[PDB]
Amino acid sequence: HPQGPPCK
Amino acid sequence: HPQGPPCK
Amino acid sequence: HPQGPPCK
Amino acid sequence: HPQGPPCK
Amino acid sequence: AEAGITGTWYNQLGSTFIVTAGADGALTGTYESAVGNAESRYVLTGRYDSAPATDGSGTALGWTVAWKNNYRNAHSATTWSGQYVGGAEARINTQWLLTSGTTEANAWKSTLVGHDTFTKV
Amino acid sequence: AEAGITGTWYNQLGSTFIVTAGADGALTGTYESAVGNAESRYVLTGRYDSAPATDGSGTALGWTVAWKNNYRNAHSATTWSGQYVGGAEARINTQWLLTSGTTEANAWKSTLVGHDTFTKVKP
Amino acid sequence: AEAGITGTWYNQLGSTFIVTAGADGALTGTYESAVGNAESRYVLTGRYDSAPATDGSGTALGWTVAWKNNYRNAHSATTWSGQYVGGAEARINTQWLLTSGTTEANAWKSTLVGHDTFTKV
Amino acid sequence: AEAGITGTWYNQLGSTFIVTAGADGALTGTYESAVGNAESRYVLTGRYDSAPATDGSGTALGWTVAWKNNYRNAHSATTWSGQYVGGAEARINTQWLLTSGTTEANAWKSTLVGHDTFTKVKP
């Protein structure tokens, strides 16, 4: 989700 | 507050 | 989740 | 309120 | 339906919300408070999903109202987050956050939370 | 004060908030996801108190972002409600609500709640 | 009325909540989920105001349910905060927070918020 | 794990949380207001997940405090919902809801929302 951090 | 009900 | 409605 | 900080 | 958001909505407290939904996601309107009154009106601005899923899901949206107009300033602002569901009985179900401007010492209790359901009746 | 809010801010996850506060209490700008190229920009609109109190009280404000742009559509919208506190280290402390469009049956879990703190970097 | 909280309550989703209010502020009971089922039951513990104001105000209370029992573990817990109002149509109006155990990376979206109204019908 | 939660914790306002996690998923203890003598202690009861996941996931838990004791009665109750994350620096990150008993007419503003982070100090 664009509101959370970058992925793994 | 303006968001609440009437103060009547 | 147990907090929600039935999955029926 | 007991959940907030010490008073002034 | 899409621009079914446009219109006049009422919540359970008696407030009236009048909005226009623009084809690209904007929400603009007026929020009027208690009694109907005259300058019980405040400006509101928001955004919605203009391309909601094609599954019976509601349309996500949200808007804000700063409680200041040319007659009153309650040094607070409210944001409503929720979704629109249309049909015979269209409704907008929301949860809101009302934050007041406070001093540091009162910051811990600067925000109230609640929920409102708006209908066109 | 409008100036103080205007500028570029970042929160603890690394997202970018670029806002312009207008004299009439309006807030307009763009929100960008944490790192992640250019097309992770979304439109935001909000309102603040253009005449806060003297005192050392924060300025209340709020804004919304519907997570749809020309590249992605997460069928959700987030609203941040908080206060701008100026000084040499200005901050915007908020609490937010993220609601996703759901069917009648999952409506009960349609909303997430959290809090973010923004630090100003550019005017 | 005071120990009017004691009893079986239902919310709009169909869940049943059975509680005992102790004279000193404790709330103990069982929360059962969907279908009625058999081990759709979870333990709940809370506290209420045993000396509420003598003005027509409701009684503040809250309780928690960890979603683990001897058959299921949904690695989450819900807390309901609200108030009881008695009378002909007694109700318990609440707002709740459901937090799931997550990894750091998912902590930002570990909590859901909602509201429930429980009645004895 | 019960041990990990058990102990004394403090949050950023200076309040004290003393808890005992029992094998059956129960939480019992006392909550104390930020500084302020001895009679600022209130009873708390809660529940946690006594069998969390392996992984580096936090343990979900929650507890309630009704703000009435033998000295004061603030006619309100607070519930904290969050996760315990162990390590050398264990923390309990929460979001809370404080509801006050109100009349029908002020019910709309009966609940406050906030967040607290607790740091462990003693076992």
Pairwise CB contact (< 8 Å): H112 & E111: yes
Q: Where are the beta strands (DSSP E) in chain E?
A: 7-11, 16-21, 26-32, 41-48, 59-68, 73-85, 91-100, 111-119
C-beta separation of H50 from H70 below 8 A: no
E1-121 belongs to which CATH class? Answer: mainly beta
Residue E35 distance to chain B (closest CA, Å): 6
**Which DSSP helix (H) or strand (E) runs through F5?**
helix F2-5
Pairwise CB contact (< 8 Å): E103 & F57: yes
Chain G partners within 8 Å of E115 (Cβ): 95, 115
Residue G104 sits at φ, ψ, to 5 deg, of: -50, -50
Pairwise CB contact (< 8 Å): G114 & F113: no
Is the CB of H114 inside 8 Å of chain F's CB atoms? yes
Domain range annotation of chain F: 1-123
Residue E12 distance to chain B (closest CA, Å): 9
C-beta separation of H111 from G95 below 8 A: yes
Written as six digits, the tokens of F41 are 């920009």
In the block, residue with structure tokens 């009280």 = F57
Strands G59-68 and G73-85: antiparallel
Residue E88 distance to chain F (closest CA, Å): 15
Chain F partners within 8 Å of E99 (Cβ): 60, 62, 81-83, 94-95
Task: Name residue G8's amino acid.
Answer: T
Query: What is the architecture, at CATH level 2, of domain H1-123?
Result: Beta Barrel (2.40)
* Residue ranges of the binding site of E for biotin: 31, 42, 80, 96, 108
- As a whole number of angstroms, the distance between CA E4 and CA G15 comes to 33
Residues in Cβ contact with E23 at an 8 Å cutoff, skipping those fewer than 6 apart: E3, E50
Written as six digits, the tokens of G92 are 């318990």
Residue E39 sits at φ, ψ, to 5 deg, of: -110, 65
Indicate which technique resolved this structure.
X-ray
Nearest Cα residue to F103 out of E120, G32, E52: E52
- As a whole number of angstroms, the distance between CA E82 and CA E63 comes to 9
C-beta separation of G95 from G115 below 8 A: yes
| Beta carbons within 10 angstroms of residue E54's beta carbon | 6
Q: Where are the beta strands (DSSP E) in F34-72?
A: 41-48, 59-68
Residue F48 distance to chain H (closest CA, Å): 20
Chain E partners within 8 Å of F93 (Cβ): 107
Is the CB of G117 inside 8 Å of chain E's CB atoms? no
In the block, residue with structure tokens 């109750």 = H77
**Cited resolution, angstroms:** 1.5
C-beta separation of G99 from F113 below 8 A: no
- Cα Rg for chain A, rounded, in angstroms? 5
* 3-state secondary structure labels for all residues of chain G: CHHHCCEEEEECCCCEEEEEECCCCEEEEEEECCCCCCCCEEEEEEEECCCCCCCCCCEEEEEEEEEECCCCEEEEEEEEEEEEECCCCCEEEEEEEEEECCCHHHHCCCEEEEEEEEECC
